[PDB]
Design a protein around this motif. Structure first.
Motif, PDB file in Angstrom:
ATOM      1  N   UNK A   1       0.840  -1.229   0.000  1.00  0.00           N
ATOM      2  CA  UNK A   1       0.000   0.000   0.000  1.00  0.00           C
ATOM      3  C   UNK A   1       0.864   1.264   0.000  1.00  0.00           C
ATOM      4  N   UNK A   2       0.669   2.164  -0.989  1.00  0.00           N
ATOM      5  CA  UNK A   2       1.441   3.412  -1.087  1.00  0.00           C
ATOM      6  C   UNK A   2       1.230   4.327   0.120  1.00  0.00           C
ATOM      7  N   UNK A  12       2.177   4.214  10.659  1.00  0.00           N
ATOM      8  CA  UNK A  12       2.174   2.751  10.602  1.00  0.00           C
ATOM      9  C   UNK A  12       2.783   2.270   9.284  1.00  0.00           C
ATOM     10  N   UNK A  13       2.546   3.037   8.216  1.00  0.00           N
ATOM     11  CA  UNK A  13       3.079   2.722   6.892  1.00  0.00           C
ATOM     12  C   UNK A  13       4.602   2.621   6.952  1.00  0.00           C
ATOM     13  N   UNK A  18       7.310   0.984   4.803  1.00  0.00           N
ATOM     14  CA  UNK A  18       6.796   1.877   3.776  1.00  0.00           C
ATOM     15  C   UNK A  18       6.383   1.146   2.512  1.00  0.00           C
ATOM     16  N   UNK A  19       7.205   1.257   1.465  1.00  0.00           N
ATOM     17  CA  UNK A  19       6.925   0.598   0.190  1.00  0.00           C
ATOM     18  C   UNK A  19       7.042  -0.923   0.316  1.00  0.00           C
ATOM     19  N   UNK A  20       7.926  -1.380   1.207  1.00  0.00           N
ATOM     20  CA  UNK A  20       8.121  -2.813   1.434  1.00  0.00           C
ATOM     21  C   UNK A  20       6.892  -3.451   2.091  1.00  0.00           C
ATOM     22  N   UNK A  21       6.009  -2.620   2.659  1.00  0.00           N
ATOM     23  CA  UNK A  21       4.794  -3.107   3.317  1.00  0.00           C
ATOM     24  C   UNK A  21       3.965  -3.977   2.372  1.00  0.00           C
TER      25      UNK A  21
END
Length: 21
Positions: A1-2, A12-13, A18-21
């Motif tokens: 998710x972006x 939380x992102x 972040x992008x690795x989420x």
């Protein structure tokens, strides 16, 4: 998710890699 605009979710992102989420 972006990266989400909302301040709450943005934190939380980052915690999920972040992008690795």
């Amino acid at each position: 998710r972006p990266p989400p605009s909302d301040a709450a979710a943005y934190a939380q992102w980052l915690a999920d890699x972040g992008w690795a989420s």
